[PDB]
Symmetry: C2
Subunit: 103 residues, 2 copies
């Protein structure tokens, strides 16, 4: 019912962003079997060469679906997320979490 | 293959945002039958009362899926979109279009 778009801003420069994606590669199959999870995808800009596109190369955009706030809050306490957090602490600068519903 | 997240910033105040949503209510079934379209949903913040959530009440976030850039570019020239644009010109301030792929 809830869609989460979390933008993760990574440190510029030498594979900070790929290191974050590599952490996601380890965890996404597990997140996706989490209870309440109907989607969890780390997306990056695709350069399309069109004027109307905005790009942000030090950015990963997470598109997620969660059945409820309770399920999202359990998700954040799971071990794979505390492990992720620990592993990316030198590569991430911030994360902006929106929680959305059909408008 | 392509995911578009377009954030539409509406003018603050008396139902500018609802007027935009009402335009979307007319067009979304049609957009969704467009060729190349595997999703087209106007989302708004759900107040969740949690510290980590960022909210933006004069914002609509479009989450879309398009088979290609050619299909997205045709979409923008369709009559329902030129009609939408015309109808919302006094309610919208800007639109930030990201075009994303799996990272």
């Amino acid at each position: 019912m809830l869609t989460v778009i979390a933008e993760i801003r990574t440190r510029p420069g030498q594979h900070h962003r790929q290191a974050v994606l590599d952490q996601f590669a380890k965890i996404v199959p597990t997140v996706l079997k989490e209870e309440g999870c109907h989607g969890y995808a780390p997306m990056v800009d695709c350069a399309a060469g069109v004027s109307f596109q905005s790009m942000a190369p030090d950015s990963i955009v997470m598109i997620e679906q969660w059945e409820s706030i309770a399920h999202l809050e359990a998700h954040l306490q799971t071990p794979h997320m505390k492990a992720y957090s620990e592993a990316v602490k030198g590569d991430v600068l911030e994360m902006n979490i929106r929680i959305l519903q059909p408008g």
